[PDB]
Amino acid sequence: PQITLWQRPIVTVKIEGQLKEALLDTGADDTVFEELTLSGRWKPRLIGGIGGFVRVRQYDQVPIEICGHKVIDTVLVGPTPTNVIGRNVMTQLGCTLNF
Amino acid sequence: PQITLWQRPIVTVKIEGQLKEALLDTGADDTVFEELTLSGRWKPRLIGGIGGFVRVRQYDQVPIEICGHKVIDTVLVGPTPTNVIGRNVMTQLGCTLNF
Ligand SMILES: CC(C)CN(C[C@@H](O)[C@H](Cc1ccccc1)NC(=O)O[C@H]1CO[C@H]2OCC[C@H]21)S(=O)(=O)c1ccc(N)cc1
Structure with missing residues (x-):
């Protein structure tokens, strides 16, 4: 898939039986x-991000279904205004920035 | 160009005579x-980002030199731990997420 950036690159994920949406985020x-x-x-x-720091729980080896692909990685759980899929998952998606 | 995501996707920019580095950030x-x-x-x-909010100055029609391209857009100036190139600039770069 190719995802243009006119809109936030939101995707649907399934993690440990739960359905969520998250932003594909190269800055994470x-x-x-x-x-x-x-x-x-x-x-x-x-x-730490733009507005300061948040305390999160680190869970390792979490299964994630995303973009027709199943991957297993580390997920942090904590206050964030937007769920974000980080580079840790994207490298596994074989996801690249192309222009 | 194609940028893989094994490392932070940092690029060199020239803005209003000044040389800086910034992260290509699809979540911005x-x-x-x-x-x-x-x-x-x-x-x-x-x-607003993770952790909280910051006060920024909004400047419009700022020329930016990035990735062999000259583009012109809105740049926010304020406290951030990392400079970030947002979707506003990336769409102009013809920059997409591919996998
Ligand atoms: C500042 C970056 C280097 C890091 N941030 C990722 C970034 O993509 C966040 C991702 C993000 C998105 C929404 C809310 C919080 C964080 N975007 C962001 O702060 O963008 C701000 C600038 O443009 C505005 O548009 C959206 C928020 C504003 S981060 O959220 O702090 C972050 C830091 C560490 C990890 N592991 C994951 C995410």
């Missing part, structure tokens, strides 16, 4: 969701 | 720089 190192219940152990983490 | 609606001096008038604006 990590994948981050606000309201997502994930199972298992997690480590406390702080990430 | 707008282009934002921290330490860029721009000429003319501006409007006060607040943008």
Whole structure:
């Protein structure tokens, strides 16, 4: 697929049985969701963005279905105004910036 | 050009005589720089990211040299940990996400 950027590049994901939408975000190192219940152990983490810092839970080896592809990666769960799919997942999608 | 996402997609830009680096950021609606001096008038604006909001100056019709292209767009100037090139500029670059 090719995704133009006239609009926010939002995609539908399925993670641990839950359906969500998220922004394909080349500026995000990590994948981050606000309201997502994930199972298992997690480590406390702080990430920093434009308006300051938020405390998140780091969950590892989380299954994600996105763009006709199933991938497994680290998902951070914490306050964010927008769910974001980070480079960690995009490199696995074989996703590139082309122009 | 094609930019893979194994590393942050940082690019060199020239804006109003000044040389800077910035992240090609599909999750950013707008282009934002921290330490860029721009000429003319501006409007006060607040943008929201992860962690909270920041006050920025909005400058219109700023020429930007990026990726062999000269483009002209709105640049927000304010506190950000990382300069980001937003979709406003990327659409002009003909820049797309491919996988
Ligand atoms: C500033 C970037 C280097 C990092 N940010 C990713 C970025 O794409 C966010 C992604 C984003 C999107 C919406 C809300 C919060 C964060 N966009 C953003 O802050 O854009 C601002 C400039 O344009 C405006 O348009 C949308 C928000 C404004 S980030 O959200 O802070 C971030 C940081 C670390 C991780 N792992 C994931 C995301």
